[PDB]
Design a protein around this motif. Structure first.
Motif, PDB file in Angstrom:
ATOM      1  N   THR C  21      86.150  63.679  75.238  1.00 33.89           N
ATOM      2  CA  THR C  21      85.620  62.521  75.805  1.00 33.89           C
ATOM      3  C   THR C  21      86.811  61.386  75.529  1.00 33.89           C
ATOM      4  OG1 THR C  21      83.596  63.054  73.964  1.00 33.89           O
ATOM      5  CG2 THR C  21      83.327  61.339  75.413  1.00 33.89           C
ATOM      6  N   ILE C  22      86.753  60.840  76.571  1.00 32.87           N
ATOM      7  CA  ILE C  22      87.461  59.556  77.390  1.00 32.87           C
ATOM      8  C   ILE C  22      86.689  58.605  76.574  1.00 32.87           C
ATOM      9  CG2 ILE C  22      89.320  58.328  78.595  1.00 32.87           C
ATOM     10  CD1 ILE C  22      89.826  61.266  77.189  1.00 32.87           C
ATOM     11  N   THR C  23      86.754  57.740  76.041  1.00 35.91           N
ATOM     12  CA  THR C  23      86.379  56.509  75.836  1.00 35.91           C
ATOM     13  C   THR C  23      87.321  55.109  75.889  1.00 35.91           C
ATOM     14  OG1 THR C  23      84.878  55.104  74.348  1.00 35.91           O
ATOM     15  CG2 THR C  23      86.760  56.318  73.243  1.00 35.91           C
ATOM     16  N   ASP C  24      86.321  53.654  76.459  1.00 34.40           N
ATOM     17  CA  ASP C  24      87.004  52.793  76.694  1.00 34.40           C
ATOM     18  C   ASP C  24      87.506  51.778  75.348  1.00 34.40           C
ATOM     19  OD1 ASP C  24      84.801  51.436  76.033  1.00 34.40           O
ATOM     20  OD2 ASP C  24      84.353  51.293  78.103  1.00 34.40           O
ATOM     21  N   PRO C  25      88.046  51.215  74.900  1.00 35.25           N
ATOM     22  CA  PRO C  25      88.529  50.540  74.117  1.00 35.25           C
ATOM     23  C   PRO C  25      87.804  50.736  73.437  1.00 35.25           C
ATOM     24  CG  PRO C  25      90.118  49.725  75.692  1.00 35.25           C
ATOM     25  CD  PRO C  25      89.085  50.994  76.459  1.00 35.25           C
ATOM     26  N   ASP C  26      86.491  50.106  74.104  1.00 32.73           N
ATOM     27  CA  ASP C  26      85.288  49.298  73.345  1.00 32.73           C
ATOM     28  C   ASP C  26      84.313  50.429  71.974  1.00 32.73           C
ATOM     29  OD1 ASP C  26      85.264  46.579  73.451  1.00 32.73           O
ATOM     30  OD2 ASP C  26      82.752  47.129  73.731  1.00 32.73           O
ATOM     31  N   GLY C  27      84.722  51.630  73.152  1.00 31.27           N
ATOM     32  CA  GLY C  27      84.068  53.130  72.527  1.00 31.27           C
ATOM     33  C   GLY C  27      83.260  53.477  73.468  1.00 31.27           C
ATOM     34  N   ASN C  28      83.552  52.891  74.976  1.00 34.72           N
ATOM     35  CA  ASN C  28      82.325  53.292  75.761  1.00 34.72           C
ATOM     36  C   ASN C  28      82.945  54.712  76.560  1.00 34.72           C
ATOM     37  OD1 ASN C  28      80.658  50.371  75.273  1.00 34.72           O
ATOM     38  ND2 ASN C  28      79.482  52.442  75.409  1.00 34.72           N
ATOM     39  N   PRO C  29      82.256  55.790  76.740  1.00 35.50           N
ATOM     40  CA  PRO C  29      82.884  56.930  77.157  1.00 35.50           C
ATOM     41  C   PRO C  29      82.633  56.605  79.171  1.00 35.50           C
ATOM     42  CG  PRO C  29      81.096  57.308  76.495  1.00 35.50           C
ATOM     43  CD  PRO C  29      81.404  56.142  76.184  1.00 35.50           C
ATOM     44  N   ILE C  30      84.110  56.916  79.370  1.00 39.08           N
ATOM     45  CA  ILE C  30      84.400  57.117  80.640  1.00 39.08           C
ATOM     46  C   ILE C  30      84.195  58.141  81.786  1.00 39.08           C
ATOM     47  CG2 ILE C  30      85.455  55.922  82.566  1.00 39.08           C
ATOM     48  CD1 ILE C  30      87.811  55.240  80.072  1.00 39.08           C
ATOM     49  N   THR C  31      84.984  59.145  81.238  1.00 34.96           N
ATOM     50  CA  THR C  31      84.301  60.802  82.112  1.00 34.96           C
ATOM     51  C   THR C  31      84.657  62.008  80.660  1.00 34.96           C
ATOM     52  OG1 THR C  31      84.794  62.002  83.416  1.00 34.96           O
ATOM     53  CG2 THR C  31      86.810  61.452  82.285  1.00 34.96           C
ATOM     54  N   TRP C  32      84.171  62.710  80.895  1.00 29.87           N
ATOM     55  CA  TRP C  32      83.815  63.553  79.127  1.00 29.87           C
ATOM     56  C   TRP C  32      84.493  65.178  79.812  1.00 29.87           C
ATOM     57  CZ3 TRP C  32      80.831  67.631  78.552  1.00 29.87           C
ATOM     58  CH2 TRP C  32      79.585  67.909  80.218  1.00 29.87           C
ATOM     59  N   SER C  33      85.283  66.103  78.828  1.00 29.21           N
ATOM     60  CA  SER C  33      84.970  67.375  79.437  1.00 29.21           C
ATOM     61  C   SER C  33      85.143  68.144  78.668  1.00 29.21           C
ATOM     62  CB  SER C  33      86.957  67.476  80.516  1.00 29.21           C
ATOM     63  OG  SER C  33      87.003  68.820  80.770  1.00 29.21           O
ATOM     64  N   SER C  34      84.083  69.554  78.712  1.00 29.54           N
ATOM     65  CA  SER C  34      84.343  69.925  77.456  1.00 29.54           C
ATOM     66  C   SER C  34      85.315  71.667  77.936  1.00 29.54           C
ATOM     67  CB  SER C  34      82.786  70.915  77.888  1.00 29.54           C
ATOM     68  OG  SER C  34      82.286  71.578  78.819  1.00 29.54           O
ATOM     69  N   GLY C  35      84.843  72.572  77.682  1.00 28.35           N
ATOM     70  CA  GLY C  35      84.844  73.732  77.817  1.00 28.35           C
ATOM     71  C   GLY C  35      84.838  74.720  78.694  1.00 28.35           C
ATOM     72  N   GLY C  36      82.930  74.787  78.687  1.00 30.11           N
ATOM     73  CA  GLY C  36      82.092  75.731  79.142  1.00 30.11           C
ATOM     74  C   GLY C  36      81.809  74.992  80.677  1.00 30.11           C
ATOM     75  N   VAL C  37      82.348  73.500  80.786  1.00 34.74           N
ATOM     76  CA  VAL C  37      82.214  72.999  82.114  1.00 34.74           C
ATOM     77  C   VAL C  37      83.858  73.665  83.156  1.00 34.74           C
ATOM     78  CG1 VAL C  37      84.257  71.204  81.787  1.00 34.74           C
ATOM     79  CG2 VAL C  37      81.546  70.858  82.796  1.00 34.74           C
ATOM     80  N   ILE C  38      84.630  73.746  82.924  1.00 40.11           N
ATOM     81  CA  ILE C  38      85.872  74.048  82.886  1.00 40.11           C
ATOM     82  C   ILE C  38      85.050  75.633  83.518  1.00 40.11           C
ATOM     83  CG2 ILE C  38      87.893  74.758  83.332  1.00 40.11           C
ATOM     84  CD1 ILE C  38      87.860  73.752  80.715  1.00 40.11           C
ATOM     85  N   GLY C  39      84.588  76.565  83.079  1.00 46.26           N
ATOM     86  CA  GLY C  39      84.681  77.216  84.148  1.00 46.26           C
ATOM     87  C   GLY C  39      84.166  79.072  82.715  1.00 46.26           C
ATOM     88  N   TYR C  40      85.030  79.032  81.931  1.00 45.33           N
ATOM     89  CA  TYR C  40      84.665  79.965  80.467  1.00 45.33           C
ATOM     90  C   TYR C  40      83.066  79.354  80.161  1.00 45.33           C
ATOM     91  CZ  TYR C  40      88.977  80.660  81.547  1.00 45.33           C
ATOM     92  OH  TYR C  40      90.183  81.525  81.424  1.00 45.33           O
ATOM     93  N   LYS C  41      82.190  80.546  79.482  1.00 48.23           N
ATOM     94  CA  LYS C  41      81.404  81.056  79.420  1.00 48.23           C
ATOM     95  C   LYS C  41      80.646  80.787  77.537  1.00 48.23           C
ATOM     96  CE  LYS C  41      77.313  80.115  81.672  1.00 48.23           C
ATOM     97  NZ  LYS C  41      75.991  80.924  82.085  1.00 48.23           N
ATOM     98  N   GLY C  42      81.624  81.876  77.624  1.00 46.49           N
ATOM     99  CA  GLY C  42      81.254  82.696  76.185  1.00 46.49           C
ATOM    100  C   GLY C  42      82.650  82.284  74.748  1.00 46.49           C
ATOM    101  N   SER C  43      83.331  83.635  74.380  1.00 47.57           N
ATOM    102  CA  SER C  43      84.122  83.928  73.337  1.00 47.57           C
ATOM    103  C   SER C  43      84.932  82.847  73.711  1.00 47.57           C
ATOM    104  CB  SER C  43      84.268  85.215  73.522  1.00 47.57           C
ATOM    105  OG  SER C  43      85.590  85.225  72.330  1.00 47.57           O
ATOM    106  N   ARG C  44      85.405  82.784  74.842  1.00 44.75           N
ATOM    107  CA  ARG C  44      86.237  82.639  76.152  1.00 44.75           C
ATOM    108  C   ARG C  44      86.908  80.769  75.328  1.00 44.75           C
ATOM    109  NH1 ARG C  44      89.690  85.707  79.714  1.00 44.75           N
ATOM    110  NH2 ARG C  44      88.839  86.818  79.870  1.00 44.75           N
ATOM    111  N   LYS C  45      85.582  79.724  75.170  1.00 51.07           N
ATOM    112  CA  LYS C  45      85.624  78.843  74.992  1.00 51.07           C
ATOM    113  C   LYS C  45      87.312  78.276  73.626  1.00 51.07           C
ATOM    114  CE  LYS C  45      81.395  78.484  75.453  1.00 51.07           C
ATOM    115  NZ  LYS C  45      79.567  78.054  76.014  1.00 51.07           N
ATOM    116  N   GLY C  46      86.434  78.704  72.952  1.00 46.66           N
ATOM    117  CA  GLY C  46      87.218  78.976  71.582  1.00 46.66           C
ATOM    118  C   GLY C  46      89.020  78.619  71.667  1.00 46.66           C
TER     119      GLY C  46
END
Lengths: 88, 73, 115, 101
Positions: C21-46
């Motif tokens: 998660t990318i947040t601003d100096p104050d602490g508020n998230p701008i844009t966040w990226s996971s693993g299951g958001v890229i394309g992978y769905k299970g054992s793959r994310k680890g």
RNA sequence: GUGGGAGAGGGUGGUGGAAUUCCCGGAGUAGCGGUGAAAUGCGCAGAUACCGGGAGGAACGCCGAUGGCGAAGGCAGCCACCUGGUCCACCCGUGACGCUGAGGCGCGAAAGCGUGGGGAGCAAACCGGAUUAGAUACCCGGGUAGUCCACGCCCUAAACGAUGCGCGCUAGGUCUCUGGGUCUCCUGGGGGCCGAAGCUAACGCGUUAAGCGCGCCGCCUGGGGAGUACGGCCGCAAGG
């Protein structure tokens, strides 16, 4: 807790002769101090089964001595209870 | 190896019970806020035992931390 | 466009999926990226690769907001905690300093069956 | 009676007039519970390791008193009443234990 | 008796920070979570990850040890009060006052029982998910009693050192907690490992004896049938 102040007072109160720190009379006197101090503390903190042992122990000791008294001079014993206030 | 330099060796006479002396205690805490093990403090069975209690005190008077963050990794 | 240079990059690793998660100096998230958001769905994310990707596409979304400087914050032990950081260190962002502030209890909630 | 060290920590943003107000209390609350002060060190402001009540600093008080055994816990109860006095800690005065000497 | 000391020994009141869950706000998207894989579940009433705020219960990292304390069960955040045990030194005081200990009385982990309070996390049973020839399981997501508190009952246990209490006696080496000393060494109490003599069916034990001995209690006397049956005693019941 008992203080030296109070304790030595008890001794002076029972000792057979000046400058004596350890005689049945004294021995007993002293226990009774702690005992009473203990008892009173056991009216509250009825959950302190631990200190409750030490108590029995003390009492065990106390009577252990007095039995010794009824052995040697009864005169001394008959007079100790009146000065402490035992039985019940 | 842990043969760096003990904190007792590189320090002077200091009271273990003065829980206000932050300038020193800090010497006994890790890069994090944890309490250094005896291998690191240089202290004794009794000393460490005390220094233990003392820190837990200064912690309470907001003097010494309970845990820091790490600078690398 | 919102022009928010220099911010924070929280990297939350797990034994089941790594995110960022990318947040601003104050602490508020701008844009966040996971693993299951890229394309992978299970054992793959680890996977460390999963984390790599998760990290990189997470910066590409920040460069859009003109993000340049960043302080990195790691949370936990996962599989490829490293690769995530090493990612940002090549994404094109200036890496201030890496921080480890993984949450250790001082003995509280009785953990469940698998300790 | 016994010897004690009285650690009192309160709001750092207190002004001259406000500060000496809280001391006066502390003071009056001591004679109220029979505590002769032998001495007192006023260290003042020192940066906290952690933020207490959202605020990164604190005023430091110290009070070596000689008060009643049976009224120690009480003494703090009252102390912990002013919404400004955030930290209170009383300790038995222990013979200082030197080391590395 | 006097002067020292050490300790998670117990009881009460208090109070500190981490983390957890929940609630609110901020910001922000499309997943999150979980597994060997997966699904059940949670998310566009907007979850996850992130910041700030609040509530609440439980517990108390590091220090922490192959450590300490206690009769055992058992005991660890900090502080204060109330309280038991104990060790050392001085050798002062009593003068054998001692050891054991049927029955008795008290204590007694976990679970479990009553009434009331409380409930964050965890979790019998129970509800689903997957695994399998099947799964009333091992794995995943939920989840009630319960687990925390008070008062009361229950009283069992691999309640184990599987080794009753107390005293004397019989090479040492080493590590450690703790007290006194004239403190590179002596001296006391405690915890470990190795080991003389000796013991032992052997393993092992070995001044923390399972050695040489005295006192006193407890218990065993082929396996299964049985910790059952009967009887009595106890308990609210479960049962003991």
């Amino acid at each position: 807790p008992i203080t030296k102040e109070e304790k030595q007072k008890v001794i002076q109160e029972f000792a057979r002769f000046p400058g004596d720190t350890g005689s049945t009379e004294v021995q007993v006197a002293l226990l009774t101090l702690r005992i009473n101090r203990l008892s009173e503390h056991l009216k509250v903190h009825k959950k302190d089964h631990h200190s409750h042992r030490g108590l029995l122990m003390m009492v065990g000791q106390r009577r252990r001595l007095l039995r010794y008294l009824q052995r040697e001079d009864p005169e001394r014993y008959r007079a100790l209870i009146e000065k402490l206030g035992i039985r019940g | 190896p842990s043969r760096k330099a003990k904190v007792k060796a590189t320090l002077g006479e200091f009271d273990l019970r003065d829980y206000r002396n932050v300038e020193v205690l800090k010497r006994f805490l890790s890069e994090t806020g944890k309490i250094l093990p005896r291998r690191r403090t240089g202290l004794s069975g009794k000393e460490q035992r005390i220094l233990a209690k003392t820190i837990k005190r200064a912690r309470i008077l907001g003097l010494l931390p309970f845990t820091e963050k790490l600078v690398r990794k | 466009k919102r022009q928010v240079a220099s911010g924070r990059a929280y990297i939350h690793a797990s034994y089941n999926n790594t995110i960022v998660t990318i947040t601003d100096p104050d602490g508020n998230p701008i844009t966040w990226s996971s693993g299951g958001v890229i394309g992978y769905k299970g054992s793959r994310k680890g996977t460390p690769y999963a984390a790599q990707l998760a990290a990189l596409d997470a910066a590409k979304k920040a460069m859009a907001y003109g993000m340049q400087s960043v302080d990195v914050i790691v949370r936990g032990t996962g599989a490829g905690r490293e690769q995530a950081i090493r990612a940002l260190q090549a994404s094109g962002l200036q890496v201030k300093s890496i921080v480890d502030d993984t949450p250790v209890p001082h003995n509280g909630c009785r953990p469940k069956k698998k300790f | 009676m016994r010897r004690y060290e009285v650690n009192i920590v309160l709001n750092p943003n207190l002004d001259q007039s406000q500060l000496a107000l809280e001391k006066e209390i502390i003071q009056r609350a001591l004679e109220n519970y029979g505590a002769r002060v032998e001495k007192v060190e006023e260290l003042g402001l020192r940066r906290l390791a952690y933020p207490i009540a959202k605020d990164p600093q604190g005023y430091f008080l110290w009070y070596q008193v000689e008060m009643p055994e049976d009224r120690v816990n009480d003494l703090a109860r009252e102390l912990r009443i002013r919404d400004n006095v955030r930290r209170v800690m009383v300790v038995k005065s222990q013979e200082p234990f030197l080391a590395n000497a």
